[PDB]
């Protein structure tokens, strides 16, 4: 399949070179997989989700995404126009308030929730969790992310946006999950992206167009935007049978575009998520 005039990041993950405009992908499109978006919620009614999104848990007064962030990230995972895995099932877990903030105890509880809830969902191609969130180092947060991964969920987490070593951020610094840095459309490390030995992969994160609340769309930037590219790529690759929840991060690193990014500090991977699609 090919999507012409795609958001740059979608085109990027299906090209060995920057600057293209068509997103090439197998039409299975993540069908049969499920991705939990652990965030501010998801506006499931957005036409771009086509009935494939639903809220399954909230830690606030409403399940409504009153911010937009969670809807944006969900859209990069799996919306029709803006998503990597256009036929996946999306599940929203609202651990962040409508200002985009959340307490660690709440974020932990939402991870544990997914580890259990997935046992009551039909996800025959597997389960992914996208965590476009985090703050400073916390062993308890890292342990929660490790638990979610061990339970059989492909965990993708944001590296953080401090132009600093991700070793001092959580859940970014948990080794056993997939820690995602951000790049721009010219294959530079995004100006804000964290780096370091714990990063597994880069994805597009500067000026990413996706869904927003109110049935809208907008472009924003962050390692929060890179993360759902990787989560969606994992779902896509799991539906194709190429990898599993346990092995998907490693598979994505194995198959990544290598040494194409600039301003990567020595000791950080120079690896850009790539679907290696061959019509």
Q: Which is nearer to Ca ion, 123 or 159 (CB)?
A: 159
Task: Give min distance, CB of 271 to Ca ion, in A.
Answer: 12
Binding at 55: pick from Ca ion, Cl ion, none (beta carbon under 5-8 Å per type)? Cl ion
- Known binder of ligand: residue 187? no
- Active-site hit among 14, 39, 46, 132: 39
Residue that has been written with the tokens 């198959």 in this structure: 255
Query: Rounded CA gap, 256 and 16, in Å?
Result: 9
Query: Which residues of 63-221 form beta strands (DSSP E)?
Result: 89-94, 126-131, 135-136, 153-158, 169-170, 178-183, 201-204, 208-212, 216-220
State yes or no: residue 63 binds Cl ion (CB under 5 A).
Answer: yes
Please say which residue, 22 or 58, places its beta carbon nearer to Cl ion.
58
Rounded CA separation 246/257 (Å): 21
Q: 200 is in the binding site of which of Ca ion, Cl ion, none (Cβ under 5 to 8 A by kind)?
A: Ca ion
- Neighbouring CB atoms inside 10 A of 5's CB total 9
Q: Is 39 a catalytic residue?
A: yes
Burial label, 244 (beta-carbon count in 10 A; 0-12, 13-18, 19+): middle
Residue list 82-111, contact with Cl ion (CB under 5 A): none
C-alpha 52, offset from chain centre: 17
Q: Is 260 annotated as a binding residue?
A: yes
74 is an interface residue for Cl ion by CB under 5 A: no
Q: Is-catalytic flag, 46?
A: no
CA torsion 256-262-263-265 (nearest 10°) is 40
- 117 in contact with Cl ion (CB under 5 A): no
Say which of 33, 46, 65, 69 is annotated catalytic: 69
Residues numbered 178-217 forming contacts with Ca ion, rule: CB under 5 A: 200
Number of residues that bind Ca ion (CB under 5 A): 1
Distance CA 90, CA 79 (A): 9
Active-site residue list: 39, 69, 224
The annotation places the binding site for Ca(2+) at 16, 175, 177, 200, 260
């Amino acid at each position: 399949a090919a999507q012409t005039n795609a958001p740059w990041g979608l085109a990027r993950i299906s090209s060995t070179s920057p600057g293209t405009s068509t997103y090439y992908y197998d039409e299975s499109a993540g069908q049969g997989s499920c991705v939990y978006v652990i965030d501010t919620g998801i506006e499931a009614s957005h036409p771009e989700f086509e009935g494939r999104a639903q809220m399954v848990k909230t830690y606030y007064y409403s399940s409504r995404d009153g911010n937009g962030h969670g809807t944006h990230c969900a859209g990069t995972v799996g919306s029709r126009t803006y998503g990597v895995a256009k036929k996946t099932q999306l599940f929203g877990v609202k651990v962040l308030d409508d200002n985009g903030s959340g307490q660690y105890s709440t974020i932990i509880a939402g991870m544990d929730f997914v580890a259990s809830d997935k046992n009551n969902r039909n996800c025959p191609k597997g389960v992914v969790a996208s965590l476009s969130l985090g703050g400073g180092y916390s062993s308890s947060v890292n342990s929660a992310a490790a638990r979610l991964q061990s339970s059989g969920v492909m965990v993708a987490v944001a590296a953080g946006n401090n132009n600093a070593d991700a070793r001092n951020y959580s859940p970014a610094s948990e080794p056993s999950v997939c820690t995602v840095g951000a790049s721009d459309r010219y294959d530079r490390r995004s100006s804000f992206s964290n780096y370091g030995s714990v990063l597994d992969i880069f994805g597009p994160g500067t000026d990413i167009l996706s869904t927003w609340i109110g049935g809208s769309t907008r472009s924003i930037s962050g390692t929060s935007m890179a993360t759902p590219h990787v989560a969606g790529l994992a779902a896509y690759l799991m539906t194709l049978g190429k990898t599993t929840a346990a092995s998907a991060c490693r598979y994505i690193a194995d198959t990544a575009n290598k040494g194409d990014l600039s301003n990567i500090p020595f000791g950080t991977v120079n690896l850009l998520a790539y679907n290696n699609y061959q019509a």
